[PDB]
Design a protein around this ligand. Structure first.
Ligand SMILES: CCCCCCCCCCCCC/C=C/[C@H](O)[C@H](N)CO
Ligand SMILES: CCCCCCCCCCCCC/C=C/[C@H](O)[C@H](N)CO
Ligand SMILES: CCCCCCCCCCCCCC(=O)O
Ligand SMILES: CCCCCCCCCCCCCC(=O)O
Ligand SMILES: CCCCCCCCCCCCCC(=O)O
Lengths: 251, 274, 57, 238, 274, 238, 57, 57, 60
């Protein structure tokens, strides 16, 4: 069916033209068991105050646009009380729910690829050098891809067909993905569990997964139609818990 | 049997409302359409299997990971032994096979292939006994030997193997020796909590070093030797498969690249020839 | 100790013997005959089970 | 002691043997396995995933995003082909760099049936019908829709469901085909032709875009591992 | 017992209408006449057997299939390694034994006999360690090494065996690795469907290559080596027996010949002497 | 570990051993066996097949079809032999190149009884009778039909059934004979003489043709494999 | 695992032991003691069974 | 003689075989799987058993 | 005798193997074990003992 509703915390999300819900690699986000845990102290578990939908900034799908990416959970640094527990606790563990919505018309056309890339290590633009943190993820805005080659000395290689990683951009469909076809679809929701090699990790020096939105089939329309087609991203943490409470840093 | 492939059940003509070919990729779903939905097929008993395509049969083949040379000369004591910070990034044929998966957990056999020669110049040997090599593994933080004939070559706790030339290659087994629960091939993050330092997997690689030397002075001439290390991962579990790499590697500590074309060119979009 | 297992032959004296000599589990031979698979996690990672003959949308 | 006799093949190093070896660090305590999601048990779980096919790889389109897109257009139509390529999933400019063809280059032999899924990424008011044909390699490649209707073909009506799976059967005389193919183990051609054509209302974009996907069925198999001819090096990477 | 021969049952005189000697070859039939039909025989218990004349006892003997030489010199990097597209047509003694049958399906053991020497000239070695050889099998389509010390000698997936000189010869087993269901020794046909291209069995031979090299530089002199490959087919089933060949072979990819006489001459048709 | 002791014969390469070896490509999936007709289980199923014997191999007849044909003629007759050759199935100019003698040259010893079948390829109105004799090697070869009637002989009447099997018995003092024979293991001679002669009606061809066949019985055996001295080479074939 | 089979001796302690050490069927020793035969396919490839004593034509 | 014992594996065909070939007890392999301990002799070498929750003095 | 095959890793000296070896002096009579107090079974019985920490290690 095409109508869904996802209620988390004090916030709901209603859609009327939905494809389905892709759920990670099969499993649902849950809490850390006693069989796998290694932190000795008691973990905190804020149910409603942390696990709720946060709406990020809006971008503009232009006719010459090529792609964007957000790195998580760094994109929700100043989003409510989820970002306040990250500063006070040394450890964190959470799953997510990534709702991406872009409605245009019956007369517009286009396509998007919404992947969630775990451990998306990204390559620099000047080889024999290294990126900096200010070039990987902005504070709330989207870092975009470039159609041509990136010339910078400390930026990500933001070419689009190599996906910023050195791999084929068509082969990104292994990861949990949907497609926003403006002919059939309106929104794309992806539920990602906690994917890491360690049971918990500090969510300041480790981007857990990267959300990429890439238009494979570009946007065209007619001059009678609208000329502003925005994309909005709404991400909710799910089953979040923390350890290691100390002073806030930073700040 | 195990683990065979599915058979094609026989099919006749049809006129149905249940069309299986028409689907929707927008849900992020790969279709389960077998050939019996779009054409008439016959009952064949497919006896093929996928034993050669499992994870354990794909990775349990030894590959070279380093090539190290060392002398037996006098002077320049850095050439009298070789060093290796343990990596799986220096030789590309095993680096690309590992980097189809994000995480990996396995045991390993490590085979050392040492092959020597006689160095040229005046005052050659003309009668030499066999050579013997000591291949010491230093876990992270141990005493590093500054040269050959050092106190750190005693190795009361470091595992060392002694090997005379002419016999079978040396081989031992190593368990899953990581700190975490999987060898992270990719690490999207930093080393310091202030988002500064070393971006990438090079901060997670803390496995130790490998040192190899001649335990014999000789006293007449020089003989170089070439240690080649071979890695065979066994008892392998793997998680989160990645796309295979497209651009060629540049560095042994980075995923840095230069942007390459997606495929090789062809003449036309409809180029069924020739 | 004699773990008699079957060899690899193609479907149209097939048994072998194996002893574990060393005291460590990492010393064993490779597990070349574990042929499980579960491709539904990447092919069908949905919340609702999708039928082929029924329409998707 | 016991009298033995060393057979040929002693003191050699075969890279793909299954032998026991003494452990370097004995009685080592390994960290416990945690349930990481996404376990790969077989490489055919990766090749069974659809991935976008660069069928428009005519330079200059391989250094852009236009390699993955198929142009379709308006008037009048149907004396033109949509696309066309040989069926060679391991050795082709089209789809050896896809997810199916990357794992195929690690092996020498392949078998089974290949799926091709086609998404229509035009507007929601655009109609159309196409013919998606596959031809066995016995004869010459087709040049029009009268020669292409005789092979295995489906007819795709674009509507509320915007995808159609053309499932290429496994028709050969051998149980396996080579990955690096030749004139002996050739598989044929895959063509696409206009059935009726695009009819758009006034105020709609006249031209659209089709995307191509490729994956394996549940009877696909590979055999005879080898190294890929895809990546190279000259010296050790520092 | 198995598999013995038939005994001759005893026979007396006879005067019958049932004549077994008179037959008709025109039906394409070889007669079943034992000696007891044309003469008086005695009861002997024949204890002979045909164990030495079976298919498995006839073909399970190793035969040489190639002789390849390679150097350890400087310059001309094609001589630093050897190549072989895998055939059973280059050495005649195994080619003729296979070509009594049309089809063949078997497993195989492959033994490598490497024998070196010292090359002449000035600046000889006078003290050399043992040599070690890498014998890589490349399945059809893999990366071909352009020379020794190449990236393709890593062999993360190609099976390679390393062998020091002085030990037993290297030996491994290979299954029935064909595409079809039998190794076709003969192929009456073409490669292209337009009846053009390569007529004969050379289009069906897609088995890969074999590369052998020295893994050691030496650094003083040159030492040539000679790889001899040996093939022993085991678990053999064979079909459609052919007449043995008469004219000597010329090419390794053809059945081309020059017309030879059917036998050797003799003096007269009635030449019972001497 | 376990104390062993290496016997003589270690690290050698015997070409005809039966040893196990580690597989180069493990867990390989082999194509299934299909029922191809004509399976050879033993080499004696090929040597038991009749094949035409070049008994007329006097040069110049070996570079033509005339080696396989035996001349018989009209008047008067019977002071002439039809043919004659020694019994040496592995080493003879006559029948070492037949189907029986080609497999015999792969072995050193042979035993058993040999069949000789004779087809009369004259006209259907021609009569005739022949004497097909075989002689043990104790004495001199026969020179006429009075010396050739004492050995093992059959009399062949040519009629509606146009073949006769002269079955040479196995008479020797040893259980086996050499293939490359000598004066010790000689087997004797095989002769053929006119009993009455050819009588043809007027209007019929006066001369005819006999063909000779040779195969093994069901008590034939070979032993001691060796290489054939039949094919040679100088260098590797390119 | 101990497949005790009989040795080769001529008709006028004859048993041997054999273990399969490796996990592949192509790794085994040769099947030197399978002595079946069927020469009727080439000697008598007829549609009708022909008797020796009865005449052919 | 076949002393079948268990290998070393981590808690989330694990048996090995061992024969003593020589006639001396010093010829054996190492006793690597004897994991007893008693740390009370150095941690709590008291005459009176001390309770944690009860005060010491 | 018995046909064997030497695997890789033969005639090497791994310092941490567990192999049997023939005794140099056979049938040796060892002195009996007396109950010496203070037996160490594990190295963690030593690390579980409190020891004074030089936290004021500023030279001088
Ligand atoms: C002289 C005795 C030498 C003993 C040999 C042991 C040294 C090797 C130990 C490290 C090997 C463990 C496997 C390492 C794999 C890579 O580090 C991971 N893929 C990266 O995390
Ligand atoms: C360095 C490791 C070398 C591994 C050796 C394996 C290479 C040999 C594989 C091919 C041999 C299979 C038997 C081939 C037989 C002939 O090709 C057929 N008679 C012709 O169809
Ligand atoms: C150290 C290993 C020595 C070889 C193992 C002992 C010889 C084989 C014994 C077979 C029966 C073992 C008991 C079961 O398992
Ligand atoms: C890897 C092979 C080691 C040798 C085989 C174990 C020793 C012989 C055991 C004999 C009894 C095996 C059970 C039956 O078969
Ligand atoms: C000198 C040691 C030779 C090897 C030991 C004999 C072979 C293994 C026998 C296994 C059964 C032994 C009886 C129990 O223990």
């Amino acid at each position: 069916d095409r109508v869904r509703s996802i209620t988390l915390g004090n916030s709901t999300i209603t859609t009327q033209e939905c494809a389905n819900v892709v759920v990670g690699y099969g499993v649902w986000p849950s809490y850390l068991q006693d069989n796998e845990a290694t932190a000795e102290d008691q973990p905190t578990q804020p149910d409603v105050a942390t696990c709720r939908f946060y709406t990020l900034d809006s971008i503009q799908w232009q006719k010459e646009s090529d792609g964007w990416w957000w790195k998580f959970p760094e994109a929700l640094k100043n989003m409510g009380l989820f970002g306040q527990n990250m500063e006070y606790h040394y450890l964190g563990r959470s799953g997510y729910t990534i709702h991406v919505q872009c409605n245009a018309s019956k007369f517009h056309q286009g396509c998007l690829l919404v992947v969630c890339v775990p451990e998306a290590e990204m390559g620099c633009s000047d080889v024999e050098r290294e990126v900096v943190a200010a070039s990987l993820s902005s504070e709330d805005t989207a870092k975009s891809f470039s159609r041509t080659e990136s010339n910078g000395q400390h930026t990500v290689q933001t070419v689009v067909y190599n996906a910023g990683m050195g791999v084929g951009v068509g082969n990104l469909t292994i990861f949990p993905h949907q497609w926003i076809n403006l002919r059939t679809n309106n929104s794309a929701t992806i539920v990602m569990p906690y994917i890491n090699s360690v049971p918990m990790d500090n969510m300041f020096r480790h981007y857990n997964f990267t959300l990429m939105i890439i238009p494979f089939a570009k946007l065209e329309y007619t001059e009678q139609a609208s000329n502003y087609v925005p994309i909005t991203v709404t991400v909710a943490p799910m089953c979040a818990e923390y350890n290691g409470l100390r002073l806030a840093s930073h700040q | 049997a195990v683990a065979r492939v599915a058979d094609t059940m026989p099919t006749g003509p049809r006129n149905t409302e249940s069309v299986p070919a028409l689907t929707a990729v927008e849900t992020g779903h790969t279709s389960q359409v077998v050939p019996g939905d779009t054409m008439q097929t016959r009952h064949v008993k497919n006896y093929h299997s996928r034993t050669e395509s499992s994870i354990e049969n794909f990775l349990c083949r030894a590959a070279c990971v380093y090539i190290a040379t060392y002398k037996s000369a006098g002077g320049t004591p850095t050439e009298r032994y070789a060093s290796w910070r343990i990596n799986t990034r220096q030789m590309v044929q095993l680096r690309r096979k590992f980097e189809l998966f994000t995480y990996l957990r396995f045991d390993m056999e490590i085979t050392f292939v040492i092959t020597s020669t006689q160095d040229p110049g005046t005052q050659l040997a003309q009668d030499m006994p066999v050579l013997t090599h000591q291949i010491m593994y230093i876990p992270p933080g141990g005493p590093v030997p500054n040269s050959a004939t050092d106190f750190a070559w005693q190795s009361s706790t470091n595992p060392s193997i002694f090997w005379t030339e002419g016999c079978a290659p040396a081989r031992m087994s190593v368990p899953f020796i990581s700190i975490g629960n999987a060898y992270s091939n990719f690490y999207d993050g930093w080393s310091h909590f202030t988002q500064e330092g070393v971006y990438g997997f090079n901060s997670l690689n803390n496995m130790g070093h490998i040192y190899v030397r001649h335990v014999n002075e000789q006293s007449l001439g020089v003989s170089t030797s070439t240690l080649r290390v071979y890695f065979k991962p066994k008892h392998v579990r793997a998680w989160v498969p990645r796309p295979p790499r497209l651009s060629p590697y540049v560095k042994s500590s980075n995923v840095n690249f230069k942007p390459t074309a997606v495929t090789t060119e062809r003449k036309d979009i409809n180029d069924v020839g020739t | 100790g004699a773990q008699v297992s079957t060899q690899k032959t193609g479907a149209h004296t097939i048994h072998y013997t194996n002893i574990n000599y060393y005291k460590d589990a990492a010393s064993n031979s490779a597990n070349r005959q574990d042929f499980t698979q579960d491709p539904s996690k990447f092919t069908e990672p949905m919340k609702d089970v999708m039928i082929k003959s029924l329409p998707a949308l | 002691g016991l009298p033995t006799m060393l057979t040929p093949g002693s003191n050699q190093f075969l890279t793909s043997d299954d032998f026991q070896s003494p452990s370097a660090m004995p009685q080592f305590d390994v960290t416990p396995e945690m349930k990481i999601p996404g376990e790969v048990h077989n490489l055919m779980e990766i090749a069974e995933v659809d991935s976008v096919v660069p069928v428009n790889n005519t330079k200059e389109n391989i250094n852009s995003m236009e390699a993955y897109r198929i142009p379709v257009t308006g008037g009048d139509q149907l004396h033109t082909q949509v696309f066309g390529f040989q069926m060679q999933p391991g050795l082709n400019s089209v789809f050896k760099r896809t997810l199916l063809g990357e794992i195929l280059n690690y092996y020498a032999h392949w078998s089974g049936s290949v799926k091709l899924t086609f998404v229509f990424c035009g507007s929601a008011m655009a109609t159309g019908k196409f013919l998606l044909a596959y031809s066995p390699p016995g004869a010459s490649p087709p040049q029009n829709r009268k020669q292409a209707m005789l092979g295995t073909h489906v007819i795709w009506d674009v509507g509320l469901q915007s995808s159609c799976v053309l499932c290429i059967p496994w028709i050969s005389q051998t149980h396996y085909r080579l990955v690096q193919q030749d004139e002996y183990t050739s598989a044929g051609y895959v063509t696409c032709w206009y059935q009726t054509g695009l009819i758009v209302p006034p105020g709609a974009p006249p031209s659209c875009t089709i995307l191509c996907f490729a994956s394996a069925c549940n009877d696909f198999s590979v055999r005879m591992l080898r190294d890929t001819p895809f990546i190279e090096q000259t010296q050790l990477l520092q």
